[PDB]
Amino acid sequence: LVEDVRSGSLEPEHVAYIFEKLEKKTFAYDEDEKEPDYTVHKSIRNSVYAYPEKGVAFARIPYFQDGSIMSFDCLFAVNDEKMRAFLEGVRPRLWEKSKRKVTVFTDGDGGTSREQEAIVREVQRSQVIMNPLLKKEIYRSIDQFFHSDKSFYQTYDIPYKRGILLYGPPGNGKTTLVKSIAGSIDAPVAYWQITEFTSSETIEEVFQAARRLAPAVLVIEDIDSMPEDVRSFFLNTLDGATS
Amino acid sequence: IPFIYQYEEKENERAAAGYGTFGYLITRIEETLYDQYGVFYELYASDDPNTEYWELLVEDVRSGSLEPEHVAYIFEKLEKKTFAYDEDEKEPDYTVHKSIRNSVYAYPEKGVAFARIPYFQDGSIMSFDCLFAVNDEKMRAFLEGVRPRLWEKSKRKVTVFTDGDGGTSREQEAIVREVQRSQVIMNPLLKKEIYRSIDQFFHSDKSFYQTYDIPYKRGILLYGPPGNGKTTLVKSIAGSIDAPVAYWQITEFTSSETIEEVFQAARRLAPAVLVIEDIDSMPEDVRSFFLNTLDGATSKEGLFLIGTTNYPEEIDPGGRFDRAYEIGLPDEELRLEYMKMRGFGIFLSEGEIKNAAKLTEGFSFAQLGELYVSSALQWHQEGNHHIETMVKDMTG
Amino acid sequence: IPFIYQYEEKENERAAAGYGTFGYLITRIEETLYDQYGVFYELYASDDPNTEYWELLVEDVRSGSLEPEHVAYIFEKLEKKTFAYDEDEKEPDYTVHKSIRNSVYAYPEKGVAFARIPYFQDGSIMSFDCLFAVNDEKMRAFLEGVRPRLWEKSKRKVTVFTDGDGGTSREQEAIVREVQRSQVIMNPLLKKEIYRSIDQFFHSDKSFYQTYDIPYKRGILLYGPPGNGKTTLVKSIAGSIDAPVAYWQITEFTSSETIEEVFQAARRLAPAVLVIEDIDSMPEDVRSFFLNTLDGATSKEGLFLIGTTNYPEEIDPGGRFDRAYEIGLPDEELRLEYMKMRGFGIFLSEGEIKNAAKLTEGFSFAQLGELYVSSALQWHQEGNHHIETMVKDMTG
Amino acid sequence: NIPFIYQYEEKENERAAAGYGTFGYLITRIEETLYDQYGVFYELYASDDPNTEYWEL
Amino acid sequence: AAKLTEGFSFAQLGELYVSSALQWHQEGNHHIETMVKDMTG
């Protein structure tokens, strides 16, 4: 909803303000986010929004408690049918949005942290200098996986999953090849940043998150740096193929 | 003798905070249930800490079951509807139904009724969970019925416990693969021996254990070289048992605290299969305590334990499990069973599968699976399967 | 269908807690700004979490800048004055000025205004930070102006990040030593090569990076034997750059969490120099992640990195920095530059310094400094400098 | 002209700021007391001073 | 330059580029051959 309002999308309409003397506008600008968004739009807090086509409406109702300003997130629908269809439409909406952002999971102390970024230098496939046959075979497995439709994985009861590993002397195009794939496929790309805080709890969160994004590419740079006490669990998580 | 405080107060100030709203709602809930069922319900729990039968209530309403009836809404302008959809669950549930919070439900035949009374405190919306019954006997019969209902519900699911830093986390899973006993590819003599215990434990009359005076617990260990498909075999056996199945994932966070938690939770589903995924990953400092929860002086009954290890001696020196069975890699007979099952006959005549079983000596089930994908892909891509060519390519 | 709760209430009880005071103050702040500026300010943030432009407001008032005007006090009997003095800061600021809390300020030309509304809760005095603007376009232009103002302010400072157990701690420092490029004592060919990149990055038009399509980041490493003055050299180069300078102190508390924090903070000052004091002290478990924040797939631009190490191989096997330059100990030419600069000519004729540069082969800059104090002390104490005597005393 | 959900018009009493009535009275009385004893005017420079050193002095 | 850089990684060719472009932009020369040595050094 916030992104729809922020982007000037047509489909949510502003219906009313709740309190006359609380905020009527807001801005995206968060000094804690790496990318600064300076868009100014109508407030989310203290407003009512509706998706008339969908029969769903949002009200973020402010109230005063312990000094600070808080809000209830109230959700309204016209009937049960329209509410269910709205909810069933969230995963596909988020899938489309994620095709055009890059999702990064970074393992921190508590658990993993998810940020959506845009890539700083797009790398076109044509700028990836490589043995043309090696290059065509890598790009072809990726392109065939998402876009040739999978009569194969269905007729033979084989899990719809693939993994390739890039290795070699440093400075010769592993990261470059990976960056080139983000741009050039019609599916989300996610990066998993392994850290010293990578744990079995953290591997569980990334794969539950990644799989909600499926079909997608999950990139794991420097997979050698995965801690020893979670390698077993990680293998068991890959074999959790049903999901 | 003197009293420092000598203020005497008007009786309007003897009023008890919060009681005026609460007693008014309890009175109304009782009146409304009487109006609808002609009996008198009594409060048995003011803010019930028990979660089990409250989660049965929610599943009963969610699933459109007839047994709990919506009686009343509490507040006119709070929610009358709700949905199961939580974004933090693996499997999303988009069912829309009447709200639980802000509602009164009754199991009329059972004579017990539930009310989630909303209230505002600290600018979040909370609830008192209130439980009513028509009398003590019905209250007790309801409580005694809870674990049996939980047991049937969990037959239809697999419960996975994963040890984390706070404790173990319980996730339920739908059984999307039904496994019949004929699909358990395994040495047929140990298949026979192990199912002797399994069938007594889960699929027969339980009088046997009383007749021969035998403890109602068992624990077996499956060991052997890596790659012989042990974990896939245990999940096959577990899926053929008509009883709730639980998996316990040892992690780096496994402590004596997560052990007690998981065993207590599995035991609530007794009789149940508890599968111990790779008992090797268990920290050495809890191994002594772990075996003492199997066979120590205060150990309990109700569980059929099945573990898997590649290093049998590291876990249980000697035996504190009941039996340990070695899983080797499959002989020609088992190989053929696998290839017929796995789907090789899609693109292989009967002779070609008999032949391929012959040529795959020393293959693990895993490698027979990696062979399956390869011959299948060539068959799909080209219309040719070169089994003969690909066994050799896999050897060297 | 029934409702349990049937109390219907007087409309005086639909009143929203806290809103009566708050809406009254917002109305008055808007009225007072209108009374003074003839325009209508609107609330854009009720309790603004952003700190950056609030700290510019405080520095603007502290520094007697003309740009923000004091409009009104909120409460008559709360503070009208305040002072910068906090006893927990390294450098004390004793400036006395009008209060921030309990005041309304406006940038009239910018069309945005600030109010810190005091309030009592839990027996401490807190505030709502409230932000107003005349329209969306001015609000946005104000926000877009923040980072540029922060950038100029930080040119005049050195920002030090020290990793601690909670996270990294940011302290600002006044630049008390201005360093010109002629005081950077260094091998003149690498001085020339390195400043080639530095001057393109900070002191030229940035179109170069677009023309040749080159990523707007650089990272260099300075290595060599201990005692060759590496850290003193980097601080010399850093102080000659017209851009905010940040120092990052690796400690035993350095984690992948403090790394991301510091890089994000340095990047907010982009373009900026980030000096990495002794990258050797970095824990091995974060080294892999550290280099991935330099050159991984999601690495960002805007920073000129300068590190120092005595063990180059331990950090970056191979190169994920861009260039590594070796700092040896100074030849006779560099020695002479140092001795003229350090102040030897105070008590040395021109020949004696030329001679002393000759006799100090194999001296580190540090040792030339330890020589400086000794000859200076004798010269001050006695009126004699026995350079000749003291080089030998230092050799053996 | 966008409607407002909340249309309750507030009494003049609801605008009172919690705890300010006591605090302002005390501050004013302290000011008057300091004036009555020294004939100079004192004002607040800190409502709840976080600094301890000169308080410990 | 392609034969003078036998054994170079792409990343080192990229540093050769940045260094050459800098010298070209700032001085009108490129010194491609001196730089190849400077980097093997």
Ligand SMILES: Nc1ncnc2c1ncn2[C@@H]1O[C@H](COP(=O)(O)OP(=O)(O)O)[C@@H](O)[C@H]1O
């Ligand atoms: N195959 C390549 N094609 C184009 N540029 C490359 C290639 N390999 C390396 N580079 C350049 O060198 C830099 C580092 O390469 P990278 O892809 O990170 O190598 P790796 O990840 O294999 O160590 C890249 O940012 C790119 O500028």
